[PDB]
From a paper:
As 3.55 Å dataset resolution cannot justify placement of water alone we inferred the shown mode based on the observations in the other datasets. In general, soaking experiments reduced diffraction power and had a negative effect on merging statistics; especially the Cu and Co datasets were of worse quality than the apoprotein datasets or those for other metals like Ca. In most cases the surface site involved only a single histidine residue. For small molecule complexes in the Cambridge Structural Database (CSD) the most common and second most frequent coordination numbers for Mn2+, Fe2+/3+, Co2+, Ni2+, Zn2+, and Cd2+ are 6 and 4; while for Ca2+ they are 6 and 7; and for Cu2+ they are 5 and 635. We reason that the tri-Asp site captures low levels of contaminating metal ions, most likely Ni, Co, or Cd, from the Superdex 200 resin used for other protein purifications in the laboratory.
Nevertheless, the tri-Asp site in LarE represents an unusual metal binding site that selectively and stoichiometrically binds certain multivalent cations. In the apoprotein structure the tri-Asp site is pre-formed to receive a metal ion by a hydrogen bond network consisting of Asp231, Arg228, Gly207, and several water molecules filling the site. Notably, the arginine residues form a positively charged ring around the tri-Asp site, limiting the metal-Asp interactions along the three-fold symmetry axis and likely responsible for only one metal ion being captured by these residues. We observed binding to the tri-Asp site for Ca2+, Mn2+, both Fe2+ and Fe3+, Co2+, Ni2+, Cu2+, Zn2+, and Cd2+, whereas Mg2+, K+, Cr3+, Cu+ and Cs+ did not bind at that location (data not shown).
Residue numbers in the entry:
A (entry chain A): 3 to 124, 134 to 171, 176 to 258
B (entry chain C): 2 to 126, 136 to 259
C (entry chain B): 2 to 127, 141 to 259
D (entry chain F): 2 to 127, 137 to 260
E (entry chain E): 10 to 123, 148 to 258
F (entry chain D): 3 to 125, 144 to 259
The structure:
C-alpha cells in the first residue's frame, strides 16, 4: 500500500491545518517540511532549526538555507543544553534529557504561533510523548526504502553528529573544553581528514581516524601535536584502533 | 543529429512499444533508460529487472534495486545460475557470450509473462543482444556518452552506481573451472578489502595463492591492514595471501 | 539572501543581456554560468568559448570543449598567444595583466563578431571589459556547489588548472622547450594518480609540489618519477618538503 | 692529571677497604667498579648485589646477573618491595629519594651481614646516597664518562647492558597509586612492543588509556602492527591504546 | 665441562658452515686441540649460496683452522630432486655419510656440529662468542634452498637459480632477512613486517627486475617472515 | 691467516719504532692508534687530529677524545683549506690540493717530533692495507684489543655538498654543516644536504625515506631558517 501510506500521512496533515516542524536537514525532516509545505502552505508551517554549542556553526548554517530552499519561513532558536545537569555531566541517557529540552522549546514556538502540533522526522517516558510531538512519518509506517523514494517523488535533491560523543560518560562538559574539542576537529578537517573525532580525556586528546587515513596522516604528527597542545591538551594521541 | 533530435528519436520507439521491461544496472545507460521509460510510459508500463547471480557482487545487486526504487520503477528481481552452463563454468574467452545469451533469454520470458513488447538495455554507440529481440534504444537514437551524460543531467539524474564492477570471472585465469565455492571465495575477499576503504580492488585466484591487485597510490594507505587481510583471506580458504607488487593489472 | 534569491538576480541580469558570450574553462564556476545562460537564453543566444594557449594543458582545453558541447552549447575554440606579449615571455609580475587583457580583448572581439551584449565568466565572492555575473549576485564557493546540485550538474573539472608561468621564478624567460619540459613533467605525475601537482622549474632542478597528505602514497613512484623527469631534461628531480605552497 | 694517576687513586681506596659490597646495575660505570674490585681484592672479598623488584623488568634483572657472573664475581640478589614505602606507592616527586634510600639501606644490611667495609656504586662526576654512606669511588677519583670508557678498554671490558633501564614508575603520572597489577600492566605492554622490534619504547599509563611513546623515526615502520598492538595491549587491561603524536619524551 | 669432551678426543673435526654455532665450535676446538689437530669441513652444494661458502672459507682461515672444503650433489638424490617433505632426510644422510669418511682419513676421534650436548642456548652461545672475541660471523641466516619451493616441485638448475637470484638482489637493497617463495609463475616475497614500510619505494623496481628473472607475478606475502 | 696479519702489523710497527698517526676517529685509524701505542708506547706515538673548515667541529672534538681514551699523546693541528684557491673555488682537482695540504702538515709534525713515518687506515705508510687487511678482519681485531668506542661516522669532506666551481665560504659551509647535523639528529646518520644557492637538496637512503615522512614540515622550517628558500628531498636517494 505504497501511495496509501502517503494517504495515511497526508490525512494527519490536513487535520492539523497549521504545524511547526523540527527541521534537521536530514532526509527525514526534509521530507516532512516539504510535505507540510505542499499540503498546508508556506504560511501554516513554521520550520525550526536548533542551534547550540554542541553543533558546528557550519552544521547549523547548512540547515537554515536548506530550509529557505524549500521555501518555508524558518526560525532558528538557540538552546543551552549545558543548562541540564544531566547533559553538563554527560550521563548515558543525556540524549534523552537533550531531546526533551528541545521539544519543549519547539512546543513554545508552536503555541506562540498557533500550531496544532509539533512535527519531526522519525530513561523515563518518551521524549516526544511527554511534549506532545507528532511523528507523522513513523505513525504511517515509513521505512528507509520509502523516505528515499518519496524524496525523489517530491523532487528533493539536497539533504545533509553532536559533540557530547567526543566526551566520556560522566565527564563534565564546559564552555571551554567543548571549544577545545570543536576547534581541534576543525583543524584536522582542514588538514585533509573530513571524518575525524577528537576524543576528550582531560589533559589527553585521542584522535580517531579511519585506518586508511593513518598513513596519509603521518606527516602532520608534530604539527597536530603542537597545535592541539596550544589548544590546551597536554598529550595529543592517535587511537591505534582508528575510528 | 542534435541532442534534441536524439531525445525524440529515443522516445519514438518508447511509445511504439507501449509497455517495456528494462534490464537495469547501476550505470548511466540503464539508469537513463529506466528514467526515460518512466518519464514516457509511467511506472505501470515499466518493469525494471535486476539480475542476481553467483558472478556479481551482492552489494552491487542491492544497489541497483534501490536506484530502481528511487527512480520510481516497479522493480522485479530475477536470479541467474550462470555456473550451470558449461561454457561459463570453464571460463572460456566466449564465457561472456553464453552468459549474455542466458541473460537475454531470461528477460524475453519475463517480457512475455508481464506483457512487454520488447526488452530495453543500455547499449550506446555483442551479437547476443541482437539475437533475443533486445532493443538498445540508446543506440537506436545514436546516443553517445556525451549524449547519455547530457540527457541524464537534463532529467536531473546525478545519482548512479559508477563502479560498474566487471564480471567476477575476470578474477580467474582462463580455463580455471568456476565452482560455487571458489567464486564466493573471491567475493568475500574483495568485499572485505572494499570494506576497509579501498573501492578499487581485485583478488586474483591462483589455487593456493591469493594475489591482491591494488592501485599503487593506495598501497601506502594499505600498510596498516596487512596482518588482518592475510589472516582474513587465509580463513576464506587461501593458503597464502599476497599483495601484487605491480598494482592494478 | 537565500539561495532562492541569488538565482533570481542571475536570471534577471541574463534577460537584460538577451544575448551573451560565456568564457568556459571547465571549473565548477564557469560550468554553472554556461548552463544557466543556456537555460535562460537558449542554445542560440549563448556562445561558449574555450581558449587554447601555451600556458594551459592541451588536455584542460579538450575538457572544456566536450563539457560545453555536453551542456548543449555552441562551443567555439580560440587560440591565444600569451608568449607573443613581451611582458609575459620574460615572466614579470605584469604577466597577469597582459595575459588577461589579451584574453578579455580577444573575447570582446568575438562579442562584437558574434553579436553578444556582454562577455560572461565565472567569478565568485571571495578586468571589467566583461561581466562577472555571479559576484553581482554574491555567490560564494559553497553556493555554487549548491546551485550546481540543484540543476543536476555532474561533470566539472574537480582540480582547477592554472597558468604554467607560475612554475618559473619571476624574471626567468619562458621558452617553448622549458614550458613543455614542465607541462610534460606534470602530465606524467597527473597520470600516476596525483591530479593536483606542480613541477616547479629551477633550471636543472625540478621541485615537485605535492599535497602533504599524498606524499606518503607517493613513496612507491619515487624511482620512476626521478627516471622519467630525468629523461625530460632535469638533472635533479626533487620533492619539495613543504608541499603545495 | 692523567688517567693512570686516577686508576692509582681508585686502587688506593680498594685495598684500603679489603672487603666491599658493590651495587651492580649492569651499566657501564658499575661494570668498571665490579671489575676493578675483583682485580684488586680477589673474588672472595667482593660481593656484587643486583636488586630484583617490581620497578624493574624481570627481563632486565636477569642480564645484570649474567654480567656479574661473567666478570667472575660472587653475585647475590636481594629483592625489595618499593611499594612498602608510603612515598613510593603514591609516586610523589620525591619517590626517587625514598626509593634510592630504601636501596642503600638494604645494601648496608647485606654489607653488615657479610662483612664489607663499604657499599660501592657507579656514580661519577656528572642526594640520598651518602646519607646511608655509599662511596662513589669513581667520582672520588675524578673519573669522567670518557675516563670510564678509557679504563674499561684498558681492562678488556667490552660487554655491558648499555641501555641502562629506567624505573617503571616513570611510566605513571605523579600521584598515581602503583599496584602490583597496573605495574605489570605497563611492563607487559612494553615487553610486547620490545618483542615486535622496537627496543626503545615506553608505555605511558593513563587509566583506561595506554599512551605509546615511540621514536618518531620508527612510527613509519610501526603502522603495520597497528591493530595487533592495539588488541594485545587492550587484553592487558587498557580500554584505549594510543600512540603519542609527539613521540618519545614529548 | 665444555672443554672436557675436547680433551677426550685428542683430535677432532668441526663442521663449519658460517653460523654462530659452527663459528663457536671451530674456534674452541682450536684453542683446546691446536691448529693442526682440528680438520674443518665446509659444504659445497647446489642447495647453498656462493657467498655462504665464501663466508665459512674466510671465517675459517681467520680463526686459524686448516679448512677443507668438500662438494656434494644433493640433487642427485631421487627424494631431493623432486623435493618431497622427507628430502631433509635424504639430504642429511648425504652430508653425514661424507663426514664419516673424512674423519677416518684425517685421524679424528669425532665429528662436531652445532653443541647441544653441553646445553648451549641462543643466549649462551652469544655469551662465549663475545667472550672468545668473535666479531666476524654470518649474521645472515644460512639455509637450504628447498624451503623456497613447495613440497613436490621438481628442482632444476634454472628454477633454483631463478629463486636464488631474487634473494641476493633483495638482500642488496637493504633487506638481509628475506626469502623468495617459488610458485611456478608467482614469486612470493617474505620480508620482516617492520621493513615492509621501508620497502615501499622499491616496489616497481623489484617487480620489474624479478619479472625479468622469469616470474609472471611478483608478490609480497602479507604475512611476512 | 688472521693472527698473521697482526704479527705482520707489529713487525712493520717495530720497524718504524716511532710514528705519527693521522687520527680521524674512525675504527681504522682507531685500530692503528691502538696497535701502534701497544707496540711503541705512548711516548713513541703522537696522534694528530686535524681541525679545519671542511669537517664538523663535532667530528673534531669527538676524535680528540677518542685519542685520549686510547691513551695517546694527542696533538691538535689546524688547517686552512679555504685559504687554498684551488679548494675555495672547488675545482674538480680541489680534492688533490686538499690531500696535499693535509699530509704536508702531518709530514711536518712527524719530523718535528722524530717520527719515522705518518700512519693511516685503509684497505706515509698504510700498515693495515699493507698487510692485506680486509674489512671483516678490522672489526675482528678491534674486539680482540678491547676497542668498543669509535666514530662509526666517516664524515666525508664537506666539499662534496657543493657543485664544482661554487666558491666555498666560512658562511655557506656552516649553512650546509648545520643543516646536516639537524638531519643527523632526527635519526638518519647517512645524509647529505646538497647546496644549490636557494635550494637545499637532501640525499637520503631510499630505505629511510619511509621513516622520514613525519619530519617533513620540521626539516623545511629549520633549513629555511638556515637560509634555504626551498628545502627538497632528492627522489633519487643517496648517491
Ligand atoms: Co554555562
Ligand atoms: Co550448481
Ligand atoms: Co593515501
Ligand atoms: Co607488596
Ligand atoms: Co678564510
Ligand atoms: Co624504517
Amino acid at each position: 500500500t505504497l501511495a496509501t501510506k502517503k494517504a495515511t500521512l497526508v490525512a494527519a496533515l490536513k487535520d492539523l491545518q497549521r504545524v511547526t516542524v523540527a527541521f534537521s536537514g536530514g532526509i527525514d525532516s526534509t521530507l516532512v517540511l516539504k510535505m507540510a509545505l505542499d499540503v498546508l502552505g508556506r504560511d501554516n508551517v513554521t520550520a525550526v532549526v536548533a542551534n547550540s554549542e554542541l553543533f558546528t556553526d557550519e552544521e547549523f548554517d547548512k540547515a537554515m538555507s536548506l530550509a529557505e530552499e524549500l521555501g518555508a519561513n524558518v526560525q532558528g532558536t538557540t538552546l543551552d543544553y549545558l543548562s541540564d545537569d544531566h547533559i553538563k555531566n554527560n550521563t548515558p541517557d543525556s540524549w534523552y534529557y537533550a531531546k526533551k529540552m528541545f521539544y519543549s522549546r519547539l512546543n513554545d514556538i508552536a503555541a506562540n504561533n498557533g500550531s496544532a502540533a509539533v512535527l519531526d522526522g522519525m530513561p523515563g517516558l518518551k521524549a516526544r510523548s511527554e511534549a506532545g510531538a507528532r511523528s507523522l512519518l513513523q505513525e504511517a509506517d515509513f521505512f528507509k526504502t520509502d523516505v528515499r523514494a518519496l524524496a525523489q517523488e517530491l523532487g528533493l535533491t539536497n539533504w545533509n553528529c553532536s559533540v557530547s560523543s567526543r566526551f566520556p560518560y560522566g565527564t563534565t562538559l564546559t564552555h571551554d573544553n567543548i571549544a577545545q574539542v570543536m576547534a581541534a576537529e576543525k583543524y584536522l578537517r582542514s588538514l585533509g581528514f573530513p571524518t575525524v573525532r577528537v576524543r576528550f580525556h582531560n589533559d589527553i586528546a585521542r584522535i580517531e581516524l579511519p585506518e586508511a587515513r593513518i598513513g596519509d596522516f603521518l606527516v602532520f604528527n608534530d604539527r597536530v601535536n603542537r597545535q592541539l597542545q596550544s589548544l590546551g591538551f597536554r598529550y595529543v594521541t592517535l587511537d591505534l584502533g582508528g575510528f
